[PDB]
From Swiss-Prot, chains A, B, C, D, E, F:
GO terms for molecular function: cyclic-GMP-AMP transmembrane transporter activity; identical protein binding; volume-sensitive anion channel activity. The gene is Lrrc8a. One of its GO terms (cellular component) is cell surface. The chain holds residues 15 to 408 of 810 of the full protein. Residues 34-86, 192-221 are extracellular. Ubiquitously expressed. High levels detected in the bone marrow; lower levels found in peripheral blood cells. Highly expressed in pancreatic beta cells. N-glycosylated. This is Volume-regulated anion channel subunit LRRC8A. Disulfide bonds join C40-C215, C43-C51, C76-C200. Heterohexamer; oligomerizes with other LRRC8 proteins (LRRC8B, LRRC8C, LRRC8D and/or LRRC8E) to form a heterohexamer. Can form homohexamers in vitro, but these have lower conductance than heterohexamers. In vivo, the subunit composition may depend primarily on expression levels, and heterooligomeric channels containing various proportions of the different LRRC8 proteins may coexist. Interact with GRB2. Interacts with NOX4; this interaction prevents the ubiquitin-mediated degradation of LRRC8A. Changing T34D: Abolishes activity in hypotonic solution. It is found in: Cell membrane; Lysosome membrane.
Length: 313, 313, 313, 313, 313, 313
């Protein structure tokens, strides 16, 4: 539907930051599954269970075939490599889905999604009404107009009761902010762990005859780039959700003050909201104040009275 | 069609839990077919038909070429590996399809799908009727209104006879719950079976000269992750279907009590349902009570009488 | 078009059974083309042209390079492997297409597809007619109504002549049933033929120096699974087409008995069908009896007479 | 557009036979580019420049590395292999496109495509006209009806002049029939040429030290299957285009005989066609005779006279 | 939009010739990136820095491992191979895009694309006008008709001023013709350059110990086929653009002669075009003369006068 | 929506230059991930830590196996290769996205996107108004016309207040121009860095026994082509954005001069713009001056007065 209105700018960047976050998660994963391999080599002179590093030059020979060379690469990869280096693309992808699920849950939860689809449905008609064009400053339009005055009154009573919508949007962003804090807590705490050069001591000498081997992870660099890039990405994410939250706290969105509009419209009979209907009003005000302005007329009783006089006449 | 109304929240999470369940089933399968390989190495000093594990160090030589190294990998993979480790992604995929087939069968079975497509078709018009806007508190609308009063009466008689729809939805969720119990019965019972390090004794010494070989499954870890992840996923699935079932049992959905609505509408002439028409009413009530409220007016005979007086006039 | 009505439940499961049948046919084929390889090894001590199977252990050497190892794998694969093991996915795919072609041929054959597109086109209008809503228990609607009475009479005469449609649907399912019987006749007769371990005696000793070689087909297991799975699948297919056929035979679908409906409608003037128009009626009755019920009114001459009196008036 | 009418059953099977023809052409090509490789081995004891075929057994050694083994495979593949074996999938694909281009050229050629888009456009309206429903056995409809009588008369004169459309459809199928004959002339003449086992004598002994080598084409079998399958496919193609051609010759489609319809309609004033307008009529008659029947009324002058009397009145 | 009218047959074949041109460009490129490899072998007895070509036979040994065999293949590929052999698919693709850009630039350039979208927009209405049906041989239609007479007069003045559209179409085809001449100038001049067998003298003996090496490009044949195929393709392209150009030159398209139509319509008051409005007329005349014929009536002043008399009346 | 109007020719080439820029970025990246490999060979006689380059010829032997040959290739690739050579396709892709984000941000920013969607919405109706057709030289149209006069007056006041739209478009192109300058600053400064032949001195002799190795990057050439091609591409990009910027500076787009149009229309009562409404007018003028011309009539008060007199009458 026309839910583009329903997403402020802090939700729209958030939409696309939650897309390139996916694109690196998939791009790293499809890369990981492709090779994610290592090249493990022994060390003859070992000290500390570490490579002691002790005419023309010639090649060294360890007298080993291809498979046990492949075997040793698996083990040092299996055990002497960090889980974080291996499951990095599969991890942020998981996180990328939550930030999506923690937006569309709002739109998709039925007890609210009816309220949303109702709130929008009336506002287009109110935005499109010919009669407000007169009242903002024929008879068939009056029947249509008054027909809308009634459901507006029922809608005003039907949805102002609940408070679940504001609770969800609150419950939604608050966890995503909480979620953001943890990603930075551990991810930086292990980004140092990945690195090209690595040494493994794995205790297989009945099979090869060597104990310690030096390997080399070719992708440790690139995965470091995505992490530093991803972290920098998610930092900008974390500030977006922080800002709108403070805005949700500072502004006290349960109620809306019509008192500025009623000066201009010169309508002394217009009520304020109580709960769950000013929040959605507070939202669409963020898109623009226009739709809220056109809505003052269908709410005022004297505006109906003006129609009712013109309709009787 | 507009079957989004037809799926409560317990059916909507169920829809998407039955999507990522697919995504790991395909992601594991496309991974499995790619390599699903092993690296089998012999053991010179064997005891118990097990690897006895008995200047500078040097490589061991078994004096073997690439193919018989590939050959032995197949056999130990073929026979000394668990079917569960190999066919895991192809298995949950199968299960993933059933949970889909055990939802759309309801929508797709024709003896009911007509009833559903009829039940929805009338309710939009009843939801969209201008005349209820008056009656909930012109003449052309009355012909349209009374035209709907009749088919409503025929629909009220046509579908209230059967009870197949409630039987299907019952027969549907009950097997999915039953299905969930079995997945946990065996899957945990064999998740321990998969593991990186494995040893095979395969009796081929006329061809290699060795009997026992130690292999290494590189993917045993990741498949363990998907299983523990999948099982945790399906647990949340199993609770969803459990809850709605209890709700289907506790609430006695064959009949619906209008008696709360008739207080507010102030309509003493409004009948209750008997069977297969309150269940579908009980459903859409879960989406919202609104559509049920607008439907009280087209059902009451005095409401028709009110129209009939206004239509005669 | 709206041909969903045209497919009973025995045609709808048949539609989707003829989809997963495809998915394994393609999944096996794309797998087959990928490797479908073998690992052929010689046997030094041979008896019967069979592998006689005659300090620490050491590797055996046949003194052979990679290509002639690849060469021998081709030949034993080429000649000492069953065609059924190799062309299995390419075979059921062929069969999968026939079961599709042996459904849409009905819809696509023009001499009938006009009749179908005509039969449906009138029935929507008859289903949608406002006047039947009165007659089932204004003047502009009468012109529209009587306009439909005429083409109905012409349609009643135009299509009741032929009998090709019933012949096609008969000729269609009968071959698919016949087709199903053969798939089970040979496929089980050769599913035993595939197997992991195989031995080939191929007479190439001028090139290798060995005669007999033991190979190993890694995919013999999985292809056995698809076959047992496919066969179990097609068994359920074969029963579907068997049931509707018996139903086509038991029920004598050339003619339809209106005699039950005419009791309820209280219309003594309503004729029965003769041929090729009750069959299509017998079909849509399977979807629901409703559309047939709404159609009794446009067929009865007194119903036209009732309109004709109201139209004259 | 609604050009489904424009394709008889001989054009519709032809459409889909020209699809699976593509699917094997692409499936063979994507397979060919993948490997299309050979395994060339020397022969020590040669006679006639042919492999003379002259304790336990042991491997033979030619003392050769991997690349010159790869080198020799290219040359014997390059020169001592038939072009037909290598370019088979790329060849029928070419032919597959012609049979498509030799259908849509008709629809796409503008001097005719206007005539087609005109012929169809009028016939829907004539099919949809309410007034023919009366005349086949109000005033606003008469203006619409007579409005169509005029452009029909102009269309009758505008397009009956030319004869290009019948010439194209003739020129179209005649070459496709001619084309079919050649495919069978050469393709069977070289299908014998492909085969698994092959021997090459290539004169490179300064580089390897051997002259003659025996290779093995692994795909010679499968390509033989596609050819025998393709040829059997195109035979069924060749008969389709043969049949409609004879039908185009036997039936003398430049003119159409209305004389059967005019008996039933009881209209003695109705003219026959001369050229290029009966052919398109002869076509749509093949789809059904109905549309031609509804068209007799807008063509008869007395039918206009009947309208003209009712329009004057 | 409905720009199918805007492309004559010489533009429509040109559209599809510029599609298969793409399909070989991509098919060669995706093939090139896949391997595009060589098999370089040394030559022991060299003369002229060329391979001198100087019991049973045995393999020759150069005593070399896999990588320096891979190394040498790169260098002889890098330096002793023609750029044309390597970048062929990436080259015609570039050219394939220009011929597309040198068509849609016309449609996409805004100063004209408004004129085109205006010229088409009026012509549909003029084609669809009911009143021309009378005039080619009610009052509300006259207001609509005369409403169109005015904008036609303004359009006649608004666009006849410029001459950019004819200049673009001229400037467009002239470069594509010029472009075609160059492709044949160089491409044939280097198609001889590619070839299977090649020899490289690369001066690396400190690393291998050999100087000269004979390589073999396996794809030199196929790329030769695409070039000869592509060149033959583009020849047919080059004639298309040549023909329409001569037609643009011979015919003097700045002005259009109405003088043939005005005989048939019997309208002595109808003006000819001057510039940029007869060219677009000359175009659509190529699609068909019909739309031009229907347009004579809205242009004639006496035709307006005929309407103006009927509108006054 | 119909935002094709909103993009001048300098934005349309910019759209497609920002597409092929993507196509090489992805084509280089998917190529890079595929191999991006090297072939590192040692050098026995080294001088300066550089390859000293010091019967029949024979192969040199370094006595090394495949993996340590693979190992050394990683290290010289890892450390002795430029980051620019490796991350080139991943870099311009990043830049390619900015130039896209630095266009759609304008369309997507909500505080303006409402203004844009409003500005367009009124202009279609004004373009489509029948009454302007009269006024540029009935009563129901006057109500529609005057209805538009009012919202035009409100729109004239509502949006002329702000100046954010002109600020964004300014802030948008100015950074893209600034961005272009940097790409040329560094990219040419390192394009020399990539090259086929390279030598690495990496200090691993405990593992191989050699210190210095000569490698060869096979893709250094092609990446050089894309860079020189890309740079030439982006130069043409950089001039486009330069031109429109100067045009935005020279022309003083905050205000628009109606004074030329008012001569032709002969309307002395028509006001000029002040800010943020002439800029968008200045834009659409670039598409064509027509829409601006039709807009003069709905803005002039005497034009309303002309309607108001005709509406009163």
């Amino acid at each position: 539907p026309a839910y583009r209105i329903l997403k402020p700018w802090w939700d729209v960047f958030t939409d696309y930051i939650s897309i390139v976050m996916l694109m690196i998660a998939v791009f790293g994963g499809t890369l990981q599954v492709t090779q994610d391999k290592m090249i493990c080599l022994p060390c003859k002179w070992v000290t500390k269970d570490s490579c002691n590093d002790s005419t023309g030059p010639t090649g060294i020979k360890y007298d080993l075939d291809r498979h046990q060379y492949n075997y040793v690469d698996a083990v040092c990869y299996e055990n002497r490599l960090h889980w974080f280096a291996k499951y990095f693309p599969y991890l942020v992808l998981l996180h990328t889905l939550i930030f999506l699920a923690c937006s569309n849950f709002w739109f998709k939860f039925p007890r609210t999604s009816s309220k949303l689809e109702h709130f929008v449905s009336i506002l287009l008609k109110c935005f499109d009404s010919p009669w407000t064009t007169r009242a903002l400053s024929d008879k068939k339009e009056g029947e249509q107009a008054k027909a809308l005055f009634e459901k507006v009154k029922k809608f005003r009573t039907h949805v102002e009761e609940g408070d679940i919508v504001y609770r969800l949007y609150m419950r939604q962003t608050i966890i995503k902010v909480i979620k953001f804090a943890l990603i930075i807590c551990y991810t930086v705490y292990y980004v140092h762990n990945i690195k090209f050069d690595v040494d493994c001591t794995v205790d297989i000498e009945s099979l090869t005859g060597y104990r310690t081997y030096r390997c080399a992870h070719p992708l440790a660099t690139l995965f470091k780039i995505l992490a530093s890039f991803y972290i920098s990405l998610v930092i900008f994410y974390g500030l977006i959700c922080m800002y709108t939250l403070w805005w949700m706290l500072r502004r006290s969105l349960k109620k809306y003050s019509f008192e500025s509009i009623r000066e201009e419209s010169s309508y002394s009979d217009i009520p304020d909201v109580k709960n769950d209907f000013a929040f959605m009003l507070h939202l669409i005000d963020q898109y623009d104040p226009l739709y809220s302005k056109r809505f003052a007329v269908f709410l005022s009783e004297v505006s109906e009275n003006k129609l009712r006089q013109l309709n009787l006449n």
